[PDB]
């Protein structure tokens, strides 16, 4: 009975159009998927390794609904791939159907369909019994946003609109290495289990990065914004604790855990947000230059890779 | 000696003594027992042993329940079968250290320690013996208090909370030694162990975390229980380290991460972080039939170190 | 706009001040110098090259009231060998527009913000390509920008505050050799590569308060009456950290230390994200010894992230 309405998800850090305020009441959103295994260079020295995504990029595009919508997503697991794949979404209650039913072998898909009863920004990743960790630090992870039916409020219960909307996925990689030191190569994701279960068990990632690899969000790839601007950003990371921080501004409004019953904390200079969360930040450009944004563990940031740059425009 | 009395008997974790969730008298004296158990224990299923100190012979030590105001008697035994010196540390007790300055016993002793639960929450309780402090919390000996306010839980709002069941989860980290070889130690004795803990746990990387002392503990048979409709309060605690607890299928209706219960929940959370050192509590009601995971969100520590348990709810 | 100047001392203690601003918004003026110099940080002997704000680290917390300018004059005297370029949370934008900001030895600048925003931030030194290296060798700190009215609990009524505190948390990757022994550099330069790798493992070999193991212990030991209210703000500008009370609570807690926000009630632990200051009020109500801790025990009594607290009274 309720009307359906498809959208087209775009690559990260971009979002899909939609609108903050609902113009309508709940409807069913049709979103499509297709699972990609695939080589993927993570750092400047060529470091290799095969990527498990959600339509070929790390991470997941951003979906967007509104409070009391249903989503539907059709998750399609070509048969290019040789692994199976059972997509999680923390906005969900309940299996979905149960593994049996979500699940998805190469050469099959599947429909999923959940209320999303509850507004906030939630992580969804991939689940399989026994592979988890693996799947998740392959980048197989993504976040949902779901508005309030009328946009986002400040602490006073008074609105907030964003002029630009980012989605800031940050992933942690453990890349095998032999003995030497260097780092290793494998033809399928099949043969690097072996020493990836060893790699994740000492707690040390190799690499920590936004939008897939180190750099990607820096150079010509930096996120714009104008002084002046509402600028709103989703940041998330489905398996470690992150700690995000915008050089020389602040978090106006944050919902460090992403829940937006909950009224925002306020001016926040940096703000934890837990491994297997999403969270939520707003701020205001008062001037122009080059602002980055970075996992407040500076080893992680500058070493590792989590760090990006924000160019904003205007007159100073 | 003016208040009444009243003698509790405690449970094993992670069942909770009997209690009334609203205070139905004033304040009391509610008198507790407990024996501390040096023993050998099986935290994996490859059966690696470990010298394990416990209250009471388990890891976590039992919950503690009484209500804001009561005054809080333990009688702390340690038999002359044990061969170290322990005390005990309160986070919910002020001055003393926590009545560890006042709690040290040696094997064959005992003391009886008491204290007003001025400050409702839940608390994490941890021995505390000068120079051996970590050792001994890492090797199983903590728990928890809950103080609940002489009114029961209230939401963000201000209205009652009610629960139908209570879970005390406690959360272990597990730092054991390996040779040369690769393999796990074992020792005669707690003290021939003491050199080999001291540099396992300056790694700061932890072999095992488990809830209830060992991997699968709360899986399978000894899942934890509840039926569709059912509020559910989940107390979750970690002394020495930080977690992030996610009910997989579920939420964390109202949350108390830091769990002092003065402070208003956090709504819908997907998965909250409760520091090392503290005791947080999440309320939940279950709508969906099923098997609903417990777990530690960092994936690896969950699904590789053994921090995961099951929720096996009925109903339809 | 009116001008003072102000001298700060070196942590735990404060510059004196005042909790409620007694004149409108000022231009208050401080003055630090860089100094890169060995430091023993354990009582096994262990030196490190540390890169300081005013000699200690942590270096000094500054303190201010919201909408006063906070004006620097960054000092890098020609005795030192690196360049260094400081960085406030608390300041909105870049600082250094119209003129580049770094510092090199024997060179000095004049910084200049107003302080928008209430709270406690952390301030450290951001130089280009090697922000992590500077960092987790002392040179940060934290200040504070009070609300014109003070601090306030969570009712909207007034705290105030008999002592504050500093405690800068510092963590520490002193680089070892093949054998597992601290290895030695006789400058900053000659440490950098075998620094970075000991960084990049992500474990401290030490997790310090005031600079070293036991610097607030027995006769540093911070002291305290009973009745007192204190306020302890602590800084991590690297690392996530959980400071708890031994003995004690904090009663009012603003764990990521915002003051717009109201404070936490009876925190037995708390969470401060790393490149975060966080503050905590508690009133002392029986004398003794207190423990203050990082409440990752092994980080706190292995590592030495812990000090002491002599409270006298009845
Ligand atoms: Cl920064
Ligand atoms: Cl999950
Ligand atoms: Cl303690
Ligand atoms: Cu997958
Ligand atoms: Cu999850
Ligand atoms: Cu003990
Ligand atoms: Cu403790
Ligand atoms: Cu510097
Ligand atoms: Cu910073």
């Not at 949902?144 to 989605?167: A, C, N, S």
């Not at 904390?265 to 939520?280: K, V």
């Not at 001037?287 to 992680?300: M, T």
Request: charged share 20%; glycine share 10%; proline share 7%.
């Amino acid at each position: 009975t309720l009307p359906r309405v498809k959208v087209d998800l775009v690559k990260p850090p971009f979002v899909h159009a939609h609108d903050q305020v609902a113009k309508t009441g709940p409807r069913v959103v049709e979103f499509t998927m297709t699972i990609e295994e695939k080589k993927l260079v993570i750092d400047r020295e060529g470091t290799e390794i095969h990527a498990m995504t959600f339509n070929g990029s790390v991470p997941g595009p951003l979906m967007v609904v509104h409070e009391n919508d249903y989503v539907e997503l059709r998750l399609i697991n070509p048969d290019t791939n040789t692994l199976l794949h059972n997509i999680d979404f923390h906005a969900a209650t309940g299996a979905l159907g149960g593994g049996a039913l979500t699940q998805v072998n190469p050469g099959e898909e599947t429909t999923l369909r959940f209320k999303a009863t509850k507004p906030g920004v939630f992580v969804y990743h991939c689940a399989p019994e026994g592979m988890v960790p693996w799947h998740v630090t392959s980048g197989m992870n993504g976040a949902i946003m779901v508005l309030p039916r009328d946009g986002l409020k400040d602490e006073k219960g008074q609105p907030l609109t964003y002029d630009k909307i980012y989605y800031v996925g940050e992933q942690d990689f453990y890349v095998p290495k032999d003995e030497a030191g260097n780092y290793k190569k494998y033809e399928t994701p099949g043969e690097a289990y072996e020493d990836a279960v060893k790699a994740m068990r000492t707690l040390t990632p190799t690499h920590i990065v936004f939008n897939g690899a180190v750099g990607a969000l820096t150079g010509d790839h930096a996120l714009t914004a104008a002084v002046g601007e509402r600028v709103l950003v989703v940041h998330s990371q489905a398996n470690r604790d992150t700690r995000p921080h915008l050089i020389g501004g602040h978090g106006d409004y944050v919902w460090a855990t992403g829940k937006f019953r909950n009224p925002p904390d306020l001016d926040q200079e940096t703000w934890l947000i837990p491994g297997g969360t999403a969270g939520a930040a707003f701020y205001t450009f008062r001037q122009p230059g080059v602002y980055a944004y970075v996992n407040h563990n500076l080893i992680e940031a500058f070493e590792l890779g989590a760090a990006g740059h924000f160019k904003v425009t205007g007159e100073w």
